[PDB]
Design a protein around this nucleic acid. Structure first.
Ligand SMILES: [Mg+2]
Ligand SMILES: [Zn+2]
Ligand SMILES: [Zn+2]
Ligand SMILES: [Zn+2]
Lengths: 196, 114, 133, 43, 264, 180, 773, 160, 65, 49
RNA sequence: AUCGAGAGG
């Protein structure tokens, strides 16, 4: 995630040759989607990218402190003094083909953070596994080879779908099915089933 | 954890053939060649050179998934022209052009001072 | 398999509405006073300034898969310099002795108004529109 | 660590709102999401 | 000189070659630069055994850095891929064994560079395995730092590979790539506020092509056939060799396709 | 800051005091400290119930006299319309916590985004302590090559960020590309 | 509630999700490490034993493999470390717990499960990475983002269960939803933006890219379409290539604002037999709209065709975008210097308006309207002034944005963005509200200690005139923070309240089912409804159609439907019918048209009685516009030749068709009258559209096409009926609760609190009101 | 209020009208005031409508209230779902709440009602009253792990 | 925690340039941009490597063993 | 760089979160809901030193 | 197991 509430996961990793490239040979370390800018309204992300571009080019620090007279116009004037388009756009060529892209790309350094939520700490599949001592139902927890919970809401969805058999299979054969003998008179779980 | 070994991008697996060739459906004198363990570097060049053959009616290529290093090349040619021969000619033209490029670059390099 | 309409128009209006490679063109028929033409034109390919006079032809042929024109053996049906292909989508009776035809060349549009053409410009996808200097 | 060492809790008539008097004292932004919003605060 | 693609070298150094590639279809130029990035072989450290590590770093950290070290690869085609050689793990015809031992004997911090790398295997008289050293003071890449008392003693094995398998096997750093510097082909639609010509900077390569005439219509049948390239080498392989081996690798792949066709 | 009359109202803190403070800093003479400002009546502690009876400026330039040719790109600061000042803010950015002080240009983001980042900055990996190799913690993660941000904040210097950063300056492109 | 109505289940997986443009809609990308863990008990039969033996030969450590073998004895063989997992000789009747494999039906799920569309079935596609992969046009029903979301997967364990997953809960079956009687899926994000960028008249494609795009369509026919430009240079239009993905026989008509049949701005949409004629494609055409491409295709060709249509559109547009590119930067947030000058001038003008109103109020020269306080009037006016100022500045900005403005591009496409986004980002972020009013005096008679007491100015009470581009001042920053905190509290409270509301709804209606006598009863036999929805139709088979007898002048109604063979001027023109002149003045053939017109007038009176405001567009089962458009193509009607339709044919055939429509089936008077009631509105629609003058002049049908339309209407009507066993109570509860979960925020209670008042039948409402006419 | 009304020519045209909105409610006495239209009077207190105009008017007012709740958001839900909810709230003569004291105090089986709220008191009173559960509710069959009369389970399959 | 060997983006080796950069700053009284240009680092992808690096090792080296 | 401010209990580092509370010895005047027979209240909670 | 804290959508 950047420093602006723009969280995301890796969807794919491309090698350098497949990546789009600027005429200087520079290549994005990272690519984010424009469809996450307008709804969230995080202009500071883009101003940070501009200012970081100018800072790396000029070898200075970017004063992105709040409540200063650092305008977009001043940063843009500096960047254009460095020979780049004042608004951070850059002509980029497609990696697969080598032909330029019709649209120019907003391209530059941006501070990104690696967060504690990684995938192989989350994977979990069960099939059969350990059971709880009391309920004879699957135990709880990925770190216990446990099972996922088929809560009342999921039961509701399966009822709405009309899948009675899947609902029974989830509730009995994929959990705590049990065979009990009962009396036809008492009607209770009383019979002494001396089986063999 | 689930990541494939990197060498599967360019090392052919067990029984995997570099080229598979299947006749097309609903298109006369057309064929689909599955290239295994290759990417845009080769497919784009081959399609571009095939598009220079005046007896090639159709030529396209596609990588059905970035996960896998392989692609499909569909070629349709004029009647009395096997598409495999069109591929052969395109490849030989590519090699001749690259050889000329290498020769000219070596000349210009030997002409230089640094 | 032959021509269905042919005339010469004096272009009156050119409109590049929001586009950079297409203008809509409004032309009045030379040698007619009840026939008019509206047409989207790729002005990058064939630029059309106002007051020009252009020969316009609606054809039928000369489907199967499209083929590049070989190496030169293929013979055109056009000494013209701008040819498109479209589809008729409405046959509007504007009034008595007044009919208009709407064509779509891949989303480019044509509206042609007249009265005389009757055994032509039928409910057919087949529509080659040819334009001469 | 710094954020954890400067944290407040409110054991629970509109507490979760950012009251005007919070100016300069508690952070306007740094708060948890969910059912601790506005109750847990950072100086 | 010879019919086909033409080359005119603008400038050349031991690390950079800026040239003009004329009379080439674009896909060939793109495939060439992709090959220069990805497909030509290099020698790099692909195994590390750490006898002792009393440093403040981790073994895998140092192993990563060692893999990233540039090593000489001029006579690399005279080396075998370990996957293709017949040794048990590695031999002298497929691998190069480096040795690195350093100790903090001095009170002042003792740095550990790539000049401290020692070749142990028998090179058999080929330019291979010598670490690239372009530092003006003769040292190499700063690999580690040692406090008095710490030491680092280890053995590396360097094998043959390409940047597709791991980026350490990349000979080229950045390939500058431009064409149609005046956008005559209209291959990109510029973004502007007031004037595209004023808000977009002028290319260094604009001088090498004539400006368009405003009264000229749009050349709808033009195609890109003149490219401006600049190849930068890490130093493991010279720039001229980077591009020449790129060309050779590309045509070798094409020949492999041709041979597969022959086998079918 | 403390505002008092002097030929107008002006802060009791003067450039000579700043010079002595910075001279004390550069030694790292009798060192001029924060407590010296507090004892010399230059700064004052104020709680919420007492700032009910005071009028606070925002910049020391709000005590400048008055008299058009302005920069159109700057924020619309308001002529303060005010007088009878008793104090001045040390700096408005000091209203923030340690988390939100890492955010670059948080005055150009909508507030929930700043809240989200303040919640997520505590999940960024980096060097949490230089002695991480000497502690045996239940869990620890450390960046291989931490980078100090290209876009900083004058609050970071006191938060020790650029010494112990928690991310990297990635070359980011914003592009629709392959749809992944 | 923790062990019986919902428990922990075996054969369950859970993983972080990511998107994949190269996955089909009903496909789910399953990590290989998960496929090795989840098993299906396949019984060895002569159809599988050659496959199962090799699978078990592979074993559990690699995929495709197997994990256990279960024998006739009931004993279990653990293939992981049994000494005999190399000499396994399979005997029929055993079971192999084989690895999960491609095209297995699995149940994919995201939580919270407010929807039957939250738990849909997918075809397995084993992929080589640690994330669940899914198509983007399935994110909407799940409300799934790829910012860290986890999703769950369940594996059936019997052929019956797999059948239920694949024939009831499958993703293509869920495309048209009974909630909102419209599709729940559509083209989104990159695909939605590029499809608009590509459908422009300025978008032209050359031969190489055309051929690559064509091959990218998997169901391609191999017929390279003839280009829209031939002579100067062979050039295709983006619409031309895109229409390759659209199936043949698809017709879509829609008009938007200034849409001629020449569509000067390329508005609306016209698709004639899977080839679009005019119209830029955007969210109206291809989103989850009512009557869009997805609705039409799902109803016309079927769920599977639409499911592949999603993939084809994605694979063409994503490729074109990949080679065209799209971006966004701060450049798209800047307006001209003149524009910003006008914007700050507008803000200052509204501030002066507020100041004038304020001095007026201080002079006690205000005229407080009846009902509200003097101060209430003052507030109302100031808030209105500032809201107008923000909106006018926003319009200045939006007008100043070129068509190259990527933010405007996304907004025009509908992929992302809105007016207020542009306004706040580039003009003025506007007024800040807490508890529905301006910023209060949290201090004594002031909002911040930097203001003087009793300051009601726009700045002091939470008006931010700067844009996010310009930068907020400290007080503006704090006020924005105050509002945003209120927003977060509202979110985190509404979630819990709506979850409780949803649970109460579901528990109250869980036992409501359509029985086989078409009623709607519960676990007691008690009747809730006698006909589900008072018409007995599945909501997924229902679309908005216009009732053409409602509106218009009586004069236009007469001009449209009146047929008078007893008048030379108001008789069917003989070119509209073979029996043209032979029918003029026919006395007996005018009682038929007179009864037709009489029932049409009665229809108009009845419908105006039911729908007082004269709204003609209502959701009815069978779409007849589309059937007529189809009949004009399956039989290639031409409008110069006259028809062959006897007036008797048209009138008596429509009467017989009305007689042939069934919802109930019994043979008694009361059931017959319930049937006659349940079809009354649809028969009104039928009479409005199948009128003699309409069938002859408005769409010149032949008798062949007319009988075809009659049979097609009957078929689709019988197919739009509810199915007995449908649990319409749970469906109703979820269809109410899900849009409630997305409720988020003029002196009336509304939203979640008002819904809570309605549901708990609260006696003491917070806003009781009487509306007196 | 702007109102759509049939003009003498037959079209539908806007005919604005003065409309009185109160801040309180006493329906029984206001609608008797002369000079108003007692046909069109309406309230957001649908309980008053239920106890003034009968139960069906209460049903219609309930649907109108819920519909306005949905439409405030710009959302749309098909008539059938909200109608089903309102009928369920209404089909017992008066107004039944979706609440502990409401639908969960009904003739339904004890096992179903105990699965919502007041879980154990319901079972206690069921034992005291000696209740009998038909087990035709879905919650009963969920608790017993049996196929429920739902869709695929609302019929039996036998041989020919 | 110590100078990266190569720029992540392009792969230009930067590990040999750290001591040279520090000497250009302190020894030669230069500013950061000029030193970065002098060491051949012209692309900002290469420049953010050296310019924004925190050399934490010279702190780990202060611990005794 | 360690800042302190924490304790070390059984080896684990522990932090005392600041508990927010209403200050005592402040007199506050409150209203009462309409269905209450008293109109206003003046409360004080007497906390000692 | 229990209780509690923190965190993710
Ligand atoms: Mg999400
Ligand atoms: Zn008994
Ligand atoms: Zn060997
Ligand atoms: Zn670099």
């Amino acid at each position: 995630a950047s420093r602006h509430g723009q969280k995301g996961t890796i969807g794919i990793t491309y090698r350098r040759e497949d990546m789009p490239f600027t005429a200087e040979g520079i290549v994005p370390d990272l690519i984010i989607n424009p469809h996450a800018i307008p709804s969230r309204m995080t202009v500071a992300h883009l101003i940070e990218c501009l200012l970081s571009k100018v800072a790396a080019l000029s070898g200075n620090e970017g004063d992105a402190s709040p409540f200063t007279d650092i305008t977009v116009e001043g940063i843009s004037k500096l960047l254009r003094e460095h020979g780049y388009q004042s608004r951070g756009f850059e002509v980029m060529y497609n990696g697969h083909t080598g032909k330029k892209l019709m649209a120019q790309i907003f391209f530059g350094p941006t501070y990104y953070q690696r967060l504690r939520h990684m995938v192989d700490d989350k994977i979990h599949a069960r099939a059969r596994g350990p059971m709880q001592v009391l309920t004879r139902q699957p135990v709880e927890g990925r770190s216990r080879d446990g099972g996922l919970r088929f809560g009342e809401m999921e039961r509701d969805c399966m009822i709405a779908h009309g899948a009675a058999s899947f609902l029974k299979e989830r509730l009995m054969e994929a959990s705590d099915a049990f065979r009990v003998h009962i009396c036809g008179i008492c009607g209770l779980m009383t019979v002494i089933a001396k089986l063999n | 954890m689930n990541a494939p070994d990197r060498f599967e991008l360019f090392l052919l697996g067990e029984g995997e053939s570099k080229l598979k060739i299947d006749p097309d459906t609903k298109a006369p004198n057309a064929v689909v060649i599955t290239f295994e363990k290759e990417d845009h570097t080769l497919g784009n060049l081959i399609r571009a050179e095939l598009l220079n053959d005046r007896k090639v009616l159709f030529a396209a290529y596609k990588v059905e998934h970035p996960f896998f290093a392989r692609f499909k090349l569909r070629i349709q040619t004029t009647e009395g022209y096997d598409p495999k021969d069109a591929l052969k000619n395109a490849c030989n033209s590519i090699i001749n052009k690259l050889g000329a490029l290498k020769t000219n670059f070596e000349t210009e390099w030997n002409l230089q001072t640094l | 398999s032959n021509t269905l309409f042919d005339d010469i128009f004096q272009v009156s209006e050119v409109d590049p509405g929001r586009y950079n490679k297409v203008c809509r063109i409004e032309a009045a028929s030379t040698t007619q006073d009840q026939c008019k033409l509206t047409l989207d034109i790729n002005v990058e390919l064939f630029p059309v300034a106002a007051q020009d006079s252009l020969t316009v032809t609606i054809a039928s042929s000369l489907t199967r898969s499209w083929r590049p024109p070989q190496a030169g053996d293929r013979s055109l049906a056009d000494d013209y310099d701008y040819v498109m292909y479209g589809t008729a989508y409405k046959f509007e009776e504007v009034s008595k002795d007044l009919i208009a035809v709407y064509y779509s060349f891949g989303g480019l549009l044509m509206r042609l108004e007249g009265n005389y053409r009757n055994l032509n410009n039928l409910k057919q996808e087949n529509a080659y529109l040819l334009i001469r200097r | 660590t710094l954020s954890h060492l400067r944290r407040t809790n409110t054991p629970i008539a509109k507490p979760r709102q950012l009251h005007n008097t919070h100016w300069g004292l508690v952070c306007p932004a740094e708060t948890p999401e969910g059912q601790a919003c506005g109750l847990v605060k950072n100086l | 000189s010879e019919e086909g693609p033409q080359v005119k070298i603008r400038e050349a150094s031991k690390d950079n070659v800026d040239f003009i590639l004329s009379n080439v279809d674009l896909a060939m130029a793109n495939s060439l630069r992709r090959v220069m990035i990805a497909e030509i072989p290099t020698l790099a450290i692909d195994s590390v055994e750490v006898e002792t590590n009393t440093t403040v770093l981790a073994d895998e950290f140092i192993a990563h850095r060692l893999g990233l070290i540039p090593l000489q690869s001029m006579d690399i085609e005279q080396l075998e891929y370990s996957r293709d050689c017949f040794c048990e793990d590695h031999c002298d015809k497929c691998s190069v064994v480096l040795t690195l031992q350093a100790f903090g004997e001095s009170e002042s911090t003792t740095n550990v560079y790539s000049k401290d790398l020692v070749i142990v295997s028998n090179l058999m008289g080929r330019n291979i395995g010598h670490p690239i050293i372009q530092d003006k003071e003769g040292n190499g890449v700063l690999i580690c730092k040692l406090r008095k008392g710490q030491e680092l003693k280890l053995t590396c094995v360097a094998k043959k590979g390409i940047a597709k398998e791991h980026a350490k096997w990349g000979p080229a750093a950045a390939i500058e790539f431009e064409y149609d510097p005046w956008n005559k082909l209209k291959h990109t639609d510029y973004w502007y506020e007031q004037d595209s010509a004023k808000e977009w900077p002028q290319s260094k390569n604009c001088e090498y092509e004539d400006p368009p005439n405003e009264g000229d219509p749009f050349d709808y049948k033009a195609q890109a056939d003149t490219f401006y390239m600049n190849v930068e080498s890490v130093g493991s392989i010279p720039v001229d060799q980077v591009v020449v081996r790129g060309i050779d690798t590309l045509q070798k792949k094409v020949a492999s396709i041709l041979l597969a066709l022959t086998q079918m | 800051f403390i505002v008092e009359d002097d030929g107008h109202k002006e802060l009791k803190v003067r450039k000579g005091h700043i010079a002595k403070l910075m001279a004390t800093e550069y030694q790292d003479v009798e060192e001029y400290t924060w407590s010296s400002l507090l004892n010399e009546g230059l700064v004052e502690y104020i709680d919420a119930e007492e700032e009910e009876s005071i009028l606070i400026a925002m910049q020391p330039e709000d005590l400048e006299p008055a008299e058009l040719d302005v920069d159109p790109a700057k924020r619309i600061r308001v002529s303060h319309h005010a007088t009878t000042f008793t104090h001045c803010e040390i700096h408005p950015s000091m209203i923030l916590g340690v988390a939100a002080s890492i955010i670059p240009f948080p005055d150009h983001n909508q507030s929930p985004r700043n809240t989200y980042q303040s919640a997520m900055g505590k999940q960024a990996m980096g060097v949490f302590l230089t002695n991480y190799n000497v502690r045996m913690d239940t869990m620890a993660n450390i960046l291989y090559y931490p980078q100090k941000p290209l876009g900083t904040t004058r609050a970071m210097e006191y938060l020790k960020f650029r010494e112990l950063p928690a991310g990297q300056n990635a070359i980011v492109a914003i592009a629709c590309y392959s749809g992944y | 509630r923790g062990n019986l109505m919902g428990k922990r289940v075996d054969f369950s997986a859970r993983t972080v999700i990511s998107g994949d443009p190269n996955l089909e809609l009903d496909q789910v990308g399953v990590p290989k490490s998960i496929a090795k863990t989840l098993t299906y008990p396949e019984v060895v039969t002569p159809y599988n034993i050659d496959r199962l033996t090799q699978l078990v030969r592979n074993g559990p450590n690699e995929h495709p493999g197997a994990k256990y073998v279960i024998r006739d004895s009931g004993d279990r063989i653990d293939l992981r470390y049994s000494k005999r997992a190399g000499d396994i000789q399979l005997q029929y009747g055993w079971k192999v717990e084989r690895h999960i494999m491609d095209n297995d039906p699995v149940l994919f799920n995201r939580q919270p499960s407010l929807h039957k569309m939250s738990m849909m079935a997918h075809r397995v596609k084993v992929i080589p990475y640690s994330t669940f992969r899914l198509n983007l046009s399935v994110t909407s029903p799940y409300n799934a983002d790829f910012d860290g979301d986890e999703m769950n997967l369940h594996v059936p364990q019997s052929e019956e269960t797999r059948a239920e997953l694949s024939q009831l809960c499958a993703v293509p079956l869920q495309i048209v939803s009974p909630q909102s009687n419209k599709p729940c899926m559509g083209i989104v994000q990159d695909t939605l933006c590029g499809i608009r960028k590509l459908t422009l008249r300025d978008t032209f494609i050359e031969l190489d890219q055309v051929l690559n795009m064509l091959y990218w369509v998997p169901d391609w026919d191999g017929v390279i379409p003839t280009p829209a430009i031939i002579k100067p240079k062979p050039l295709w239009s983006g619409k031309q290539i895109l229409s390759v993905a659209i199936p043949n026989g698809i017709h879509l008509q829609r008009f938007d604002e200034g849409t001629t049949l020449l569509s000067p701005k390329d508005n609306g949409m016209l698709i004639i037999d899977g080839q679009i004629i005019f119209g830029v494609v955007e969210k109206k055409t291809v989103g989850s709209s009512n009557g869009g491409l997805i609705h039409v295709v799902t109803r016309e060709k079927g769920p599977q065709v639409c499911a592949k249509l999603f993939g084809n559109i994605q694979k063409v547009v994503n490729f074109w975008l990949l080679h065209n590119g799209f971006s966004t930067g701060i450049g798209d947030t800047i307006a001209d210097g003149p524009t910003m000058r006008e914007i700050t001038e507008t803000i200052a003008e509204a501030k002066k308006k507020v100041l004038d109103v304020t001095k007026e109020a201080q002079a006690n020269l205000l005229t407080a309207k009846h009902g509200m306080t003097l101060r209430e009037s003052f507030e109302d006016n100031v808030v209105r002034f500032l809201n107008e100022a923000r909106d006018k500045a926003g319009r200045l900005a939006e007008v100043n944005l070129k068509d190259l403005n990527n933010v405007k591009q996304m907004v025009m496409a509908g992929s992302k963005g809105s007016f207020i986004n542009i306004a706040q980002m580039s003009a003025c972020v506007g007024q800040q509200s807490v508890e529905g009013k301006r910023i209060a005096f949290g201090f004594v008679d002031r909002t911040l200690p930097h203001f003087s007491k009793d300051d009601y100015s726009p700045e002091s009470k939470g008006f931010v005139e700067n844009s996010y581009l310009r930068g907020l001042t400290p007080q503006e920053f704090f006020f924005h923070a105050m509002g945003g905190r209120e927003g977060l509290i509202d979110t985190a409270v509404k979630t819990a309240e709506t979850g409780y509301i949803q649970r109460r709804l579901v528990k109250a209606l869980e036992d409501i089912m359509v029985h086989y006598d078409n009623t709607t009863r519960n676990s007691l036999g008690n009747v809730i409804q006698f006909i589900y929805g008072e018409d007995g139709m599945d909501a997924a088979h229902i679309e908005k159609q216009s009732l053409d007898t409602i509106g218009g002048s009586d004069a236009a109604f007469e001009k449209r439907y009146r047929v008078d063979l007893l008048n030379t001027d108001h008789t069917l023109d003989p070119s509209l019918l073979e029996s043209g002149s032979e029918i003029l003045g026919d006395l007996k053939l005018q009682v038929l048209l007179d009864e037709e017109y009489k029932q049409l007038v009665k229809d108009r009176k009845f419908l105006r009685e039911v729908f007082v405001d004269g709204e003609a567009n209502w959701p009815l089962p069978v779409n007849i516009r589309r059937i007529i458009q189809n009949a004009q193509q399956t039989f290639h009607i031409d409008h110069t030749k006259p028809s062959d339709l006897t007036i008797k044919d048209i009138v008596l055939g429509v009467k017989d068709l009305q007689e042939n429509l069934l919802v109930l089936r019994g043979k008694n008077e009361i059931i017959q009258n319930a049937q006659r009631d349940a079809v009354t509105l649809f028969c009104c629609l039928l009479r409005s559209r199948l009128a003699t003058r309409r069938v002859l002049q408005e769409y010149r049908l032949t008798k062949q096409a007319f009988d075809w339309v009659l049979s097609n209407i009957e078929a689709q009507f019988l197919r739009s009926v509810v199915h007995p066993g449908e649990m319409v109570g749970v469906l109703a509860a979820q269809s109410i609760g899900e849009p409630a979960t997305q409720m988020t925020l003029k002196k009336v209670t509304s939203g979640v609190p008002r819904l809570k008042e309605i549901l708990n039948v609260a006696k003491n409402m917070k806003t009781p009101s009487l509306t007196v006419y | 209020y702007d109102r759509k009304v049939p003009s003498p020519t037959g079209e539908y045209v806007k005919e604005p009208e003065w409309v009185l909105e109160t801040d309180g409610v006493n329906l029984s006495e206001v609608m008797t005031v002369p000079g108003i239209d007692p046909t069109r009077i309406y309230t957001n207190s649908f309980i008053d409508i239920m106890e003034v105009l009968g139960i069906e008017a209460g049903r219609a007012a309930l649907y109108k209230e819920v519909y306005n709740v949905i439409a405030s958001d710009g959302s749309y839900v098909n008539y059938r779902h909200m109608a089903l909810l309102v009928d369920v709230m209404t089909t017992q003569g008066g107004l039944t709440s979706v609440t502990r004291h409401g639908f969960n105090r009904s003739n339904t089986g004890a096992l179903m009602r105990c699965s919502f709220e007041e879980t154990v008191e319901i079972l206690f009173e069921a034992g005291a009253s000696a209740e009998l559960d038909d087990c035709r509710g879905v919650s009963e069959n969920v608790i017993l792990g049996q196929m429920a009369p739902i869709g695929t389970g609302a019929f039996d399959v036998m041989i020919d | 925690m110590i100078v990266p060997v190569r720029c992540f983006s392009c792969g230009k080796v930067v590990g040999d340039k750290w001591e040279s950069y520090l000497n250009l700053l302190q020894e030669d009284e230069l500013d950061e941009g000029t030193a970065l240009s002098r060491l051949g680092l012209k692309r900002y992808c290469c420049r953010r490597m050296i310019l924004t690096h925190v050399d934490l090792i010279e702190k780990f080296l202060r611990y005794n063993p | 760089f360690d800042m302190g401010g924490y304790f070390i209990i059984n080896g684990s580092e522990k932090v005392l979160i600041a508990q927010e509370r209403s200050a005592g010895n402040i007199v506050q005047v409150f209203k009462k809901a309409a269905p209450s027979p008293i109109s206003h209240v003046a409360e004080i909670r007497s906390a000692l030193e």
